[PDB]
Amino acid sequence: LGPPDPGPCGETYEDFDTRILEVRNVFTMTAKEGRKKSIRVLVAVGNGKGAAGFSIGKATDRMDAFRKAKNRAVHHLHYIERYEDHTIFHDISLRFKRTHIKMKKQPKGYGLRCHRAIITICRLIGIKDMYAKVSGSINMLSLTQGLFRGLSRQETHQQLADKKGLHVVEIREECGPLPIVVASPRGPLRKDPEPEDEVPDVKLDWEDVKTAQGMKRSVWSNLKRAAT
Amino acid sequence: AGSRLETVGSIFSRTRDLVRAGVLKEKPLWFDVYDAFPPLREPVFQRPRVRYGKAKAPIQDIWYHEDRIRAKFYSVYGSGQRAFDLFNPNFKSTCQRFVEKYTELQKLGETDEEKLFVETGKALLA
Amino acid sequence: FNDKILNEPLKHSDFFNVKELFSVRSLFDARVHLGHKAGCRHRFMEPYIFGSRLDHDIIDLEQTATHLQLALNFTAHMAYRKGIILFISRNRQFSYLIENMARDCGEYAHTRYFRGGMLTNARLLFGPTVRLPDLIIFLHTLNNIFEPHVAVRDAAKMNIPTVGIVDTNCNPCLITYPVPGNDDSPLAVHLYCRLFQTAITRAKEKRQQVEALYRLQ
Amino acid sequence: EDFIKKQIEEFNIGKRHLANMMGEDPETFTQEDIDRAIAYLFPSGLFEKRARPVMKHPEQIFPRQRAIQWGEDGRPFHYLFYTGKQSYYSLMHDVYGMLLNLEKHQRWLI
Amino acid sequence: NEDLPISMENPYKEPLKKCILCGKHVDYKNVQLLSQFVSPFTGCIYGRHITGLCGKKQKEITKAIKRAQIMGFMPVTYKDPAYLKDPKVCNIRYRE
Amino acid sequence: VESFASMLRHSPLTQMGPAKDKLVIGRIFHIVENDLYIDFGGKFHCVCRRPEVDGEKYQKGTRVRLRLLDLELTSRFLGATTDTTVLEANAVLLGIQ
Amino acid sequence: PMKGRFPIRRTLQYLSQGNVVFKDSVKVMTVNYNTHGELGEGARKFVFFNIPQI
Numbered sequence: 001l002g003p004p005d006p007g008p009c010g011e012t013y014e015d016f017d018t019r020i021l022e023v024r025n026v027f028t029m030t031a032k033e034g035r036k037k038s039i040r041v042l043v044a045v046g047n048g049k050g051a052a053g054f055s056i057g058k059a060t061d062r063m064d065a066f067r068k069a070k071n072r073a074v075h076h077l078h079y080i081e082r083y084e085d086h087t088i089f090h091d092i093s094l095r096f097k098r099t100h101i102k103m104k105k106q107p108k109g110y111g112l113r114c115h116r117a118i119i120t121i122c123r124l125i126g127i128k129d130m131y132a133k134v135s136g137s138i139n140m141l142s143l144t145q146g147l148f149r150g151l152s153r154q155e156t157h158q159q160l161a162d163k164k165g166l167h168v169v170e171i172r173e174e175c176g177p178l179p180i181v182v183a184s185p186r187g188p189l190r191k192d193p194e195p196e197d198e199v200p201d202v203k204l205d206w207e208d209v210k211t212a213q214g215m216k217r218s219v220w221s222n223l224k225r226a227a228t
Numbered sequence: 229a230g231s232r233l234e235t236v237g238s239i240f241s242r243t244r245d246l247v248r249a250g251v252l253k254e255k256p257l258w259f260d261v262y263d264a265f266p267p268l269r270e271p272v273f274q275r276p277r278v279r280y281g282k283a284k285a286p287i288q289d290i291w292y293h294e295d296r297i298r299a300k301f302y303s304v305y306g307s308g309q310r311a312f313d314l315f316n317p318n319f320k321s322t323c324q325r326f327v328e329k330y331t332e333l334q335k336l337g338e339t340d341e342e343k344l345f346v347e348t349g350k351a352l353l354a
Numbered sequence: 355f356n357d358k359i360l361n362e363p364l365k366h367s368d369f370f371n372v373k374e375l376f377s378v379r380s381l382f383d384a385r386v387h388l389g390h391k392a393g394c395r396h397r398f399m400e401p402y403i404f405g406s407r408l409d410h411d412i413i414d415l416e417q418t419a420t421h422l423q424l425a426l427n428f429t430a431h432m433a434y435r436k437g438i439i440l441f442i443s444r445n446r447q448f449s450y451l452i453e454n455m456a457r458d459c460g461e462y463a464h465t466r467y468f469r470g471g472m473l474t475n476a477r478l479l480f481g482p483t484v485r486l487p488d489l490i491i492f493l494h495t496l497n498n499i500f501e502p503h504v505a506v507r508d509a510a511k512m513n514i515p516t517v518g519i520v521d522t523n524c525n526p527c528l529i530t531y532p533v534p535g536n537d538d539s540p541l542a543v544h545l546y547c548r549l550f551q552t553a554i555t556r557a558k559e560k561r562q563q564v565e566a567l568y569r570l571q
Numbered sequence: 572e573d574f575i576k577k578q579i580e581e582f583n584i585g586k587r588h589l590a591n592m593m594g595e596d597p598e599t600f601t602q603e604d605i606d607r608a609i610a611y612l613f614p615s616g617l618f619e620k621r622a623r624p625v626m627k628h629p630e631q632i633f634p635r636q637r638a639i640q641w642g643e644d645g646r647p648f649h650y651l652f653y654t655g656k657q658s659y660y661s662l663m664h665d666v667y668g669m670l671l672n673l674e675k676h677q678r679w680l681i
Numbered sequence: 682n683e684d685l686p687i688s689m690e691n692p693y694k695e696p697l698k699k700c701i702l703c704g705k706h707v708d709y710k711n712v713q714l715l716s717q718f719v720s721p722f723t724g725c726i727y728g729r730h731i732t733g734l735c736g737k738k739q740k741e742i743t744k745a746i747k748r749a750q751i752m753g754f755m756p757v758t759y760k761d762p763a764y765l766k767d768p769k770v771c772n773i774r775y776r777e
Numbered sequence: 778v779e780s781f782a783s784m785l786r787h788s789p790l791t792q793m794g795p796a797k798d799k800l801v802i803g804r805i806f807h808i809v810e811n812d813l814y815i816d817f818g819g820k821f822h823c824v825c826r827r828p829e830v831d832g833e834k835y836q837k838g839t840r841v842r843l844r845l846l847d848l849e850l851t852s853r854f855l856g857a858t859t860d861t862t863v864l865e866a867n868a869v870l871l872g873i874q
Numbered sequence: 875p876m877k878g879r880f881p882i883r884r885t886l887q888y889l890s891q892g893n894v895v896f897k898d899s900v901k902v903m904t905v906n907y908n909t910h911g912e913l914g915e916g917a918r919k920f921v922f923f924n925i926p927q928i
């Protein structure tokens with residue numbers, strides 16, 4: 001729908017784009033009015049470049065609740081530290097209440113393999129394509145809250161380098177063996193190398209092994225999806 | 229008009245990213261002041277947890293060499309033998325005078341506790 | 355058209371002679387290092403508290419003095435830019451003194467019952483174009499009831515550099531520039547109020563002097 | 572606040588008109604003349620002390636909207652604006668200070 | 682430097698209090714002490730809240746009382762009248 | 778210039794040692810209809826009503842004597858993660874000087 | 875995820891990452907060590923990690 005309205009003195013929030021997500025008709029009895037036809041909505045507003053944020057606006061109306069949720073989102077703008085608008089920093093394996101989030105870092109032109117709500121959230125944030133295994137139950141509100149918590153809890157590259165000190169060594173397969181540093185410390189430099197302890201204790205997921213070994217098989221494994 | 233995210237972390241980085249993206253069109257005047265003299269600990273939200281298992285606090289009980297002397301004094305004799313003031317700094321009461329006379333005799337004496345305690349008592353009686 | 359206000363004050367440490375306003379001995383004379391019991395002590399307040407004297411917490415005056423210097427410099431730089439400061443207090447032990455100090459200072463105060471969200475909904479409750487408080491100084495973070503004041507919540511929701519003397523109950527992590535120390539004795543409160551008044555007056559005097567220097571052109 | 576001044580000017584113009592045009596040429600005519608005019612050339616046929624034609628000073632009948640306590644640049648002049656009802660809190664503080672001083676020394680309205 | 686805290690054994694503290702019979706050896710023959718914790722109206726044994734003994738000591742005292750009652754060294758439904766000269770040991774609520 | 782611990786090692790609250798049964802003087806800064814806001818320098822303060830001796834004499838700016846009965850007076854209850862503190866002493870009184 | 879401690883120990887890829895290939899001569903491979911004895915850290919780590927690869 002249309003963008004949010006500006007503020008009293010200004011704050012041209014028209015740049016952001018609104019996108020209603022879910023709609024629910026709640027019937028709650030009362031002392032005399034009976035089943036109150038209350039409606040609860042969760043809207044997410046944000047054009048991109050990190051500027052975004054969800055909100056809630058329950059009421060017994062439609063446009064009123066929509067504009068209330070829009071104003072709440074305008075007053076609740078979340079920011080997510082990003083690295084090159086295309087993919088998230090690293091993977092996240094969270095367990096928000098009862099909704100699991102298993103994300104995988106993928107390159108450009110890979111495709112959006114995630115929930116349609118997650119697809120819209122990424123389109124509003126700026127992320128182009130990124131794989132994500134929507135494990136656990138499918139609760140819109142809890143899933144969105146967990147996704148926001150995970151996006152807010154992320155270790156960037158510059159901060160990690162400044163904390164540890166060592167540079168970011170990488171051997172990209174697309175390019176040649178020429179290593180290109182992505183981040184450098186802001187002062188000191190740990191001359192000693194990391195404790196290269198082989199066979200570490202990285203609790204990987206069974207889905208990762210099934211995908212690496214191609215053992216996953218079903219009637220809906222990796223089938224062709226719609227366009228756009 | 230801005231955001232009200234309190235249970236996320238620190239407001240410094242929030243304002244920084246809001247000004248970078250373009251939300252906060254008008255730079256807050258306190259930004260430069262906070263940057264010139266930052267605090268010792270960033271105001272990051274922390275849920276007030278509780279010490280369940282064997283987790284203890286780092287704070288301990290402070291003790292000085294005069295604590296044992298004052299304890300022995302209060303054990304031997306009765307309560308304070310003087311209307312303590314405590315209004316002026318480093319007030320010299322009967323207990324404080326005894327502690328001072330002790331520190332003058334023990335340490336700096338190297339003999340025994342009973343003899344020096346009796347000497348301090350006699351000096352106080354004098 | 356005077357961009358020097360954003361560079362002259364923020365250049366030298368203690369521009370308005372912050373460390374000279376108070377003294378370590380003067381602060382110790384008030385016995386501010388004292389604190390409540392370990393049971394009443396807060397978890398996050400452990401790093402700021404040093405030890406205990408028979409279950410009587412003691413706060414290292416060095417960190418408190420550093421935090422006080424930082425907060426005083428911040429308030430002086432804010433006054434140099436013309437800003438509003440809001441004093442809070444509810445223990446009803448020195449409300450008259452805080453009111454007299456606010457009267458002496460060139461700012462406002464509010465040490466009475468705080469209704470349900472007066473700063474959040476300031477658009478409708480207060481005027482539409484109201485100069486919201488740009489700084490907060492807590493004189494008694496603990497109100498009549500053992501419950502953290504809502505001022506910190508409103509500040510975190512409004513993004514305001516919060517100042518105050520945190521006790522052994524509140525959460526200094528929620529406050530920007532906390533100041534550990536006693537918050538019950540009379541001499542300590544009087545010294546803190548006098549220091550704040552002197553800091554504000556000296557900051558205003560330095561602002562006027564710098565304005566005159568600019569006008570000399 | 573501008574509405575108050577506009578209504579005051581309108582009332583002044585109406586008073587000037589009712590004085591000059593009508594026979595009552597002295598501009599100092601009291602409210603008795605207005606009451607007589609209402610009783611004669613305005614037979615309301617009612618008995619309400621409110622709905623009846625009452626045209627007097629607007630401040631005496633209007634719920635005056637408090638003007639802007641501060642002009643430009645914000646900064647409320649009163650040092651007790653964030654306390655809600657600055658006058659009441661100021662009076663309370665003054666009474667408390669007077670009581671404290673008098674202690675150191677040693678029907679109502681609707 | 683020379684004024685830092687010390688790791689002392691907590692001075693200014695008095696040792697824990699004691700009951701009315703800690704460093705002693707109870708016996709099933711001490712009818713006087715056994716009956717002292719008994720009422721002369723129903724032969725009831727005073728509890729711990731009012732009496733103020735420890736777990737082990739109170740357990741031993743009540744065991745000795747029961748042994749004397751069974752064997753025959755103390756009246757069960759009343760207190761021994763031949764050994765009434767006993768100071769106010771327990772806080773006899775009745776009779777004030 | 779003395780360090781922080783140097784002053785604490787020779788402070789009144791630390792020089793007196795314990796805090797149980799002592800003879801200490803006090804003063805009042807505010808008078809109530811019956812209560813007396815007695816003070817003696819420290820963390821918290823104390824309160825007391827008009828005693829028998831020197832009833833009408835204990836005015837603003839007088840001197841009294843305290844006994845120091847727990848400067849903090851705090852105790853932990855069952856259903857409460859925080860201890861119910863009193864923030865006062867209210868020690869026994871004696872007289873002037 | 876995997877219900878084990880060191881999932882990297884068994885991932886095929888980690889097993890194929892080996893290099894040693896016993897010649898057509900050795901017939902049996904017997905190994906024994908004391909686990910409680912921390913002195914044998916090398917033998918323990920071997921029997922734990924390299925046995926799947928072998």
Ligand SMILES: [Zn+2]
Binds near residue numbers: 496523524
């Ligand atoms: Zn506290």
Ligand SMILES: [Zn+2]
Binds near residue numbers: 735738739740
């Ligand atoms: Zn026992």
